[PDB]
């Protein structure tokens with residue numbers, strides 16, 4: 161249903177104040193659907209076609225953010241053509257414009273922030289940026305008692321130069337543990353338990369920075385992000 165005041169739009173598009181945008185409007189210099197609009201409060205709907213001094217001001221759709229609970233057997237990109245993308249779950253216009261701010265492997269489930277906001281996304285995904293992801297990891301063999309520390313100090317991924325930046329591991333059950341990592345390498349958790357001689361059976365992402373997965377968002381389900389959620393991300 162997204163829409164906005166015509167002035168607020170001319171404002172954003174021109175890099176001027178809404179107060180001045182309003183002015184330019186009464187100056188008979190703003191057009192909608194090929195007609196002169198002198199009202200600053202005009203309700204600008206997507207199907208409209210705005211123009212400034214004859215020049216068409218491309219309607220840059222507002223940005224969207226969504227919380228998804230990724231189910232198994234689906235991927236977060238089209239890089240692979242053997243599995244359907246998680247887009248099969250987003251009933252939204254031009255959904256294809258959305259990208260996962262942090263992809264989840266085909267059989268990993270949990271919080272996946274679908275967004276078409278490049279700036280926002282990058283700040284969450286940059287390899288240089290400290291962002292905390294917290295997973296619920298199910299293990300083949302009871303977590304080794306000395307694993308805990310090993311993760312805090314750090315482990316060396318098989319054939320990797322550096323060490324995994326300190327991670328805190330909590331023990332829910334002998335074989336189920338919650339893991340928090342501020343990094344984001346490729347298949348990092350799986351390989352981490354690899355180094356310490358264990359195997360990841362299941363893997364669920366609960367948190368990304370300041371956004372946590374709702375307790376009642378069934379896998380496959382999603383929902384727009386809350387104003388606070390956007391601003392708080394990390």
Ligand SMILES: O=c1ccn([C@@H]2O[C@H](COP(=O)(O)O)[C@@H](O)[C@H]2O)c(=O)[nH]1
Nearest residue numbers: 263264265268341346347348349350351
């Ligand atoms: O510590 C981590 C973080 C992520 N992943 C998994 O690795 C993936 C990233 O690779 P890709 O989804 O871009 O192919 C995440 O999707 C998730 O399933 C892990 O095994 N360990």
